[PDB]
């Protein structure tokens, strides 16, 4: 049932990235406070990057003979990420920490994806997860730096 878990983790990523995109969009829209003018457009950049991973991962899953999740209901039910109603009263520091938590989870997911693909010998999938992990971890450093903190990976 070849590359069963590589396919499974690719599909887990499809759901998680779909929710991550929704969370980033909420931060983008609901953001208020000093720093808005830099961080609001920054969320657009992050979203575009996340969308990039979604399409690389979902393509790779299809290529491997899988069937990507492709309804909001599948994304919601399969994602390990939780969403809450939007709220303008959240601080900038609080909004950025939420993004850090989302990104820490993605970097962990991508590590799992890297591990599982390596074990099954799916080196193409392995590379996709490694590249994505690398960038997310770099963003974790930068976001944490803004927050006067070490990356603490």
């Amino acid at each position: 049932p070849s590359l069963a878990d590589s396919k499974a983790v690719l599909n887990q990523a499809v759901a998680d990235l779909s929710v991550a995109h929704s969370i980033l969009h909420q931060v983008h829209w609901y953001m208020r406070g000093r720093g808005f003018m830099i961080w609001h457009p920054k969320m657009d950049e992050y979203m575009e990057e996340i969308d990039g991973y979604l399409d690389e991962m979902s393509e790779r899953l299809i290529t491997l003979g899988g069937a990507p999740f492709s309804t909001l209901k599948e994304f919601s039910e399969n994602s390990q990420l939780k969403e809450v109603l939007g709220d303008y009263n959240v601080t900038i520091e609080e909004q950025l920490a939420r993004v850090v938590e989302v990104f820490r989870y993605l970097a962990a997911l991508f590590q799992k994806g890297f591990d599982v693909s390596d074990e099954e010998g799916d080196s193409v999938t392995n590379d996709i997860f490694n590249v994505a992990k690398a960038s997310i971890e770099k963003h974790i450093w930068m976001l944490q730096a803004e927050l006067g903190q070490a990356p603490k990976l």
Copy 2:
């Protein structure tokens, strides 16, 4: 302008679901015409997303609170999603896109109507511009399908 705000938020939900449906069509497509229509879904998706950000931004500007979770999109949208299926024909998939766009154009007409009544002329333009392009796509998709636009 509670009604203009209401229809803008309705659009946020529907455009969120429409993007998901376009993505499923993009991914699950099989048959002759794949190489043209697969990347065309990406164009439609980018356009849909552009409407999502215009309408969401305008709602925020009017003092509203956009839907901003998958649960809100799914619960509020009037579009129905189904499981992805590689066995759907390319002609059926394009017909599905047409039905989604017919829905959107009708939603944008409603948004036009509501904002026009409230005198919200900026919101009004947004719906009108979107409607124009969606209707143009309907013509092209229907022409590929050997049909009149039948607006």
Copy 3:
């Protein structure tokens, strides 16, 4: 279309003063956030100048004579200028911009209304487009300032 011509000319004056005020904010700005907001004023200035040229030139096209001297701009504009002062806070400078933009959005509503009354739909569109972008800026500035747009 005397009213539409009149409001276009009012905008020529007010945009001309708006430009000066934006330039004052750009030059006298001090405080954390300078590096983002200083260049931002140049973007706002370029946009305001775009409205100026096109409103002034619509007025010419309609058989009008636009204000074209500093004296005409000062004496016809309803916006008041004050002496540059480096001790104004970043947050108060942004609030000054918001106040200027609230004024412009309100003026552009008036221009929409009068041109709509007179059936000058070309002039109507010019005001509608300008108002849209100015209102979007009020949302962003107010957000930086920890506040709702409150249009």
Copy 4:
């Protein structure tokens, strides 16, 4: 000219003839100003062609059938063509272009009126945008000619 479809198709014919007259001006031009105005006709021609495809597209989208033969253009257009002549002056050629543009601006107003009555807001916008640009060119051309726009 009962409906938007009829006004769009009229525009299809008139824009086709307008293109032809502009091309004649381009080719037969002689006199001081040639080096400016010869390439300017190309810009105008491209602009006229943009209106053509738009208006034709919209007509097809609305379920109509555009005129699509030279006979149909020539017989349905209110514009009148004459034989090319090198002996027409620059200032007379520019005046000929002004008359065509006045005609088109008038036609676009007619399309604006009808689409508004029907509540075809998409078609209404198309005529509005085309009218705005053509009216600006009338100002410039008349200005070259030492004249007010006289819309």
Copy 5:
């Protein structure tokens, strides 16, 4: 008295010199543009999304020949046709009313027939200009013929046929 005014039929249609073939091209390219625009607007059926915009590209290329040829005619001291009446009457291409019910296969075949005609006209122009020693005009016709011939190959290929020039 005053000089008499000759009353005679138009006559001619007589591709005997470079100036004449160029003006014939001016007329035929104008009608060819109209036919291509009809195919573009009225097209329906599978392949629309590729062939619709392809007509726009061909229209652009046709317009390019029109401006090179008509400029060369003016440069040679001629007077290009420049009214829809002169185009329609001088062109050998026949137009019909637009119809949404023509297959892609039939539409592409119509374009092939227009292109074969144009290639043939440009060969005439090449022959006429060469005999004249008008080498600049000769190259305009050669260049246009080459590209139009390449499109015939591709159109024919789409239709599952050899170019059959």
Copy 6:
């Protein structure tokens, strides 16, 4: 004008007024040559605006406070404005621009001299570069007008 800071502020006011004058010329221009000279006015305005922001930043950098209201620009400038008039000829308009430019060039020479004497070599450079290009423009405008530059 006692020092570099003073001459820089003088330039802030005069460049503000020169921009306004160039804009009037741009808007009220009529006559053969409009199509070339109308857009040229925009180029000149953009250049003058460039000098304005280089001179006013240098003044701020030097510990000064730039004029930043229309009242100040108008009161301090040696250039005088008159009401717009469509009846001024193209030749008279270009001659007005030449006179503004001759003034600016002379002001920039004074800026050069004062800064040189104070040993402010950065400010000196700014004035030298501005003077170079304004003088090149005088040659070209004079050449259009059939005359020598007569610096």
Copy 7:
């Protein structure tokens, strides 16, 4: 030392050269509905193939190796077989030929991945992995046009 990595790189030099030739044939002899999309697509595929070739050949050179560099060497050492050009081959048949060539290339690149990993040559390993990824994506899209799963 790195003998077999060098040998698999050189195998790829040969196979990619013949693959380029086959793609050019498909490009030229193509006929049928879809020509206007697929003809130019072959040029994209040829450019990508050529990219792999210069990459792999010059990694081989960098390793102290000597790339095949004549048509006879390409033709004899390649495992791909060429056939005479024939306009009567259908579009569907042509695309299926390209799939088979790409399936071969993807398997070759797996072999190259495996051999270079066995020899500790991680630079060569990555060249093959990157090339493999994009070829497999193409298989998906070609198969999809042909109404099938990728069937990797």
Copy 8:
């Protein structure tokens, strides 16, 4: 290929002198039309330099030795230069350019004939291309001057 080499080298001389004359027109031009025709001379000059370097590297390629000194250019060119004079009218300047161009078009025809006789098809194409463009320019210059091309 003695004759083809000879005429290529003749073109090296004449184009070098033609470049110098164009530059004189560029520099000494005065009168209405300066702003269009002054930079147009730069375009003509670049084109001439292009023919210069096609013809000069074809001669080298053929095993010839191009003139490469001002003495060689001046002595071998059939074009005559006179001292610059600001007093020449714009229309006379353009007349001078047309003369240079008529000469070049005639030389390029000689090039064509000589290379055709000798069977140097590459040199032949170089001349034919240069002749086409120069002759188009004659049409346009003549048209500015209110005249037929009169090739």
Copy 9:
């Protein structure tokens, strides 16, 4: 080589082998000048490939069947390939490229002649344009090697 189709197909084979030989030179190159000449082979390869595709599509267009297998190219080409050798000097490599180019230029002359005889002027120009550029390269390569082009 009977006709135009035959010489076009000869060029398909020969260009294919030439590309292979250029690629060998590119890869096996060692010596002073490598950094300029190695990438230069890529330029030459790109150009040869341009000729190949042009010449093959002209052959198809004429109703021919291009060679399209390595066996056909190798057997039909009159160029001979040898095994790659890193010990060949950079100047010997350049000399090998010249020999290939001299061969191509003569093949192109053969194609010119045959197509002219048949009256196939489109094919005639393809060969002429290719010959022109190859001959220009022969000049430059020979110049690098301190020699006349010897064409």
Copy 10:
């Protein structure tokens, strides 16, 4: 010209150390403002590197021998480096950059002086241009820091 060469060489060392210090600030930066100021350090670094290569190559051109080892940069630079520390506030970091920039502006003033004294006007210009830009940055950095430039 040995004093100009000595100060050029001084600038080589100081700019090398300046680059290093900016890089530390870039890497070790923490606090609100990071996202703007982190990439800004890269812009400054690139600017510093430009002055470096400029001044080094002027030194070479003048027959000097630039410092070209880290030991020489470190030993000759009057700037002092300390171990990187993440616990420095972003305001302290920016003040640190201001102090490096004041040093550099003062160094460039010395080079202007020495080069003027010796009549090396090329070196003089290099120092002046560099000084202008550093002084502009000091204004902006100070404005971020709520302060006058205090040059």
Copy 11:
């Protein structure tokens, strides 16, 4: 991650000295080949700076503290620098870059191995990509020098 951090920081030191050595080569280069190899050094320097910023922000991301002073770079680098000397030949300069690059490639293998052991796959890939390009440069440099890469 103890060793991956250590080897990243070694790279930070080594890349810094490597940039310095390359800059010396760039500056003190003399001999045939200068015009190609002088700018080449700039490309190599840019690439080494890319690895620097990469490796140094991966170290930071991992919770390390990059060397950020010249003293740290010199003291920790395994690469040794010497005074610049114009008498060094091109051959000798290029050989030195080769030795710098061989060292760097070896360090990157070491970094590959350590990160592989520790399972730091992101760091592993940074070293692998950097080693790949360095090794490709070793081939080209060695080819220019007439030798096999001899990795």
Copy 12:
């Protein structure tokens, strides 16, 4: 500003002849290094042409009359031309380029000194900029030739 005008005109002559000499080197070059130095002469030629047009515009702007015939250039230049010779080594060609640039650098110094004396600071800067770039080229050409700049 008589001597300022004088030296500008001298430059016009010297740049015109320098251009001719560079073109001779470009065309007659043979030997190793051709592929880099041949196009390099084009870069140098374009730069020389830039100085020509600016010096000649500045002279016009100052009320002078530039030399504008090959006779004037040749008679007024202090540069000497000889017949082109393919037998010259590339090292001897580059040496001739260095001689011409050394001359220009000295001529530019004389222009700097004379304009500085007459207080024409705009002309002064033109010469200073042109001198800096020529001298940098001398450094590079000399380095290729294994020598110091020796200004």
